[model samples]
Target: ETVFEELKRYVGWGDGDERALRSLHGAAAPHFPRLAEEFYDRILGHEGARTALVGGESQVGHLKVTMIAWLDELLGGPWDEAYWDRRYRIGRVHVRIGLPQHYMFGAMNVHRTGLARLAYERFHGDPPELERVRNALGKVLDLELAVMLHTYR
Candidate 1:
């Protein structure tokens, strides 16, 4: 089993949660660009991360779109090894780009807040559905971070 499969059972993820994520994708997709924009804005504001953002408007926009795609795929997943591999590559990129390890965790938290907020806003009235989405979202991203973090070793 892949990281996704392992976490799937560990976190009790199932079709219900899967459906929850997919359903939320429609509502969630629209928010991704903003999430990406905000994410870059934060990192760009940071002294060290700013250099990564200095590539020019086109580059920054490209990254923002990349972030959107990342979230889109994250929400719609088979959690295949290839998907996880792309995630690991992201981590390796950070390291290769000479970003401090602390920044990785910090940057991940940035996205996590966006992700959790989306779940909250979309499913606030429905606790059961919300829980499923929240738990599934956390587990999936947790698995992503875990794999990403492994590159540090």
Candidate 2:
């Protein structure tokens, strides 16, 4: 099995998890742009993290655009070999750019907290559904971190 497949298996990612994420997409979609904005703002606010961003504001603008697409894909996935290849490349880029590992962890923490809050707000009325979204979100976020960290090994 491919590394991505193995990772998914390890995390118990399955059709149910995918469905939960897909269900979340509609509610979360409208807010991704705002989330992306806040995401980078938090990154840039920190001096150490800001140092990793050499291209300055323009680069951040580009990243915000990419971040939106990424969030879209995060929920809408036909996750296959191609997805793993592309994700691994992103991890490799971090290593090449000298982005400290902690920053990646911090960056994902930003996403995790933001996404959890969104899920909570959207699905709180339906306890079962909210639980599923939380489970799926946690699994996916952890897998993302694993993929990025894989590059360091």
Candidate 3:
């Protein structure tokens, strides 16, 4: 199936605006919800995966929300910065209890790249727009990774 066909199957939309569909495909075509779902299950199911902050208590649905929020941030959509701030607060609390933030960066990267690829693909071969968003998102992820790495070092 073509990318649009695959998207129609994934999202259950009978008909979507060509531009909107293109945008969604550009933003999430490479890695749709299913791929992210599988990755989350694998990571969360691992015995050694630490549930330091919200991850420990978060159900699959919660994890999905987190992933979507990150994607929104990457796509330059409006997000509640305070919500993420609370998440960081929880991470700090987890740190006090000995959960290393660095450990989560790998998992975060997995989600980030997967979501970015999907977004890139959705844009229907628009390399410049794809590169622009990817670069912007990469910068954000880089900064977050650096902070996490430094926090535990």
Candidate 4:
């Protein structure tokens, strides 16, 4: 199996996770920009990350847009081989930029924390569905980190 497939299986990601993500996407749509801003703000604020993203406002502005798109893709499905290829490039770029893996792990938590809170707030009335959302969000984020880590090998 491909690393992507293996990683997904390790995370136990399945159709249910995919459906849960899409379901969250609707409620998450309007918040993407805000979330992206928070994600990058946290990253750029880090002294270590500053070296990785040194293009100043222009690059930061562009990255915010890319971050929004990435969030959309995360929840928007089509998580197939093509999606793997697309995400693979991100890790490759991270490698080229010499981004430390630790920061990559830490940076991902910004999205995870923000979205988990969103899921909790949105699904507070339904315990079962809330669990699904929480699980799905975690699985997907883990898969994302796994994909990025692939580049280090």
Candidate 5:
């Protein structure tokens, strides 16, 4: 039970929302790997985030692989219980490892910013597409953050 429905409804996420995000994944795919690397790099480099990377480089590599896969799958439709499970599990890991919720939230904004920038860079010329992706991205990320924050409760 991931509270998936409540969270989705809270954010007004719908099939069209999923479809909108899915449409932008292609333009984002090429940049995801790099963003994934940067994400972990930030984690390992920051004092607060580094505590979550206790195992050092070995753990970093593992997380990076997973992150890239997650990014590529970001816009995939069907935000089922399984999806929420994975996200909640991620939150659980941070919680178990004594990583503060603040760090998680900060990291989210950090990583998301890159994706937002990419979307703008690629779709800026087309205001409609840019607006679509921006709105969809915000909704998707908000849903994820809400689910994740639940683990802190």
Candidate 6:
């Protein structure tokens, strides 16, 4: 099963409006606040954003939105053909610069996994729950890698 499918089963996130949780890549930005809030509440409820290099309690929310905006741009907002063309051009540029596409994709996934793991540990302090979160993050990472690999092949 794909990582998205696996997450759907594990998180019970495929129902109703929450179905986006099953395919986090596209769905995450729109629900950024809720997701970030849940993750922070569960893991780092009391912690400030000093470690994240942001200020105040609202920093987390802002950070999440910022990330989503960046992703939207990267993925070509509105999901148009022009965006796909841009993505192809960007990919070509990366290749021209001697960066392996898999390496770039893998790095992004790794960063995402790290962020998820850190968030889980920050809020929940429960080893089992942290493990569960890690596993979920792993599945997402795997899905991203699979897509990247498929594209390259």
Instruction: Please give each candidate's TM-score.
Output: 0.87, 0.95, 0.55, 0.94, 0.90, 0.37
Best by lDDT: 2
* Cα TM-score of candidate 1: 0.87
lDDT of 5 by residue, 1-153 (tens): 236888888888788777778878878888877898898888768876676556766887788788888887677656777888788888787688777787768877975798889889888899988888888889888877887788998
lDDT of each residue in 15-121, candidate 2, tens digit only: 99999999999999999999999998997799987787778669978889989988998888866678778888889988898888878888899999999999999
Badly placed stretches (over 4 Å) of model 3 are 1-26, 29-36, 50-58, 77-87, 93-97, 149-153
Q: Give the per-residue Cα lDDT of candidate 2 at 100.
A: 83
Q: How many clashes show up per model? A: 0, 0, 11, 0, 0, 6
- The window of 10 residues in a row where model 6 has the poorest summed lDDT is 13-22
Q: Which candidate number maximizes TM-score?
A: 2
Per-residue lDDT of 53-132 in model 1, one digit per residue for the tens? Answer: 66776997788888899889988876666777788788788778777777767878887888889989999999988888
Local distance difference test, each candidate = 0.80, 0.89, 0.52, 0.87, 0.80, 0.45
The TM-score, computed over Cα atoms with residue i paired to residue i, of candidate 4 is: 0.94
Query: Under the 3 Å rule for N, CA and C atoms, how many clashes does model 3 have?
Result: 11
Question: After superposing candidate 5, which stretches have Cα over 4 Å from the reference?
Answer: none
Error of 4 at 117 (Å): 0.9
Off by over 4 Å in 6: 1-99
Instruction: Give per-residue lDDT, candidate 1, residue 108.
Output: 80
Residue 19, candidate 3: Cα error in Å is: 17
lDDT of 6 at 142: 49
Name the 10 consecutive residues with the lowest summed lDDT in model 3.
Answer: 13-22
How does model 5 score by TM-score? 0.90
Query: Which pairs clash in the backbone of model 5?
Result: none
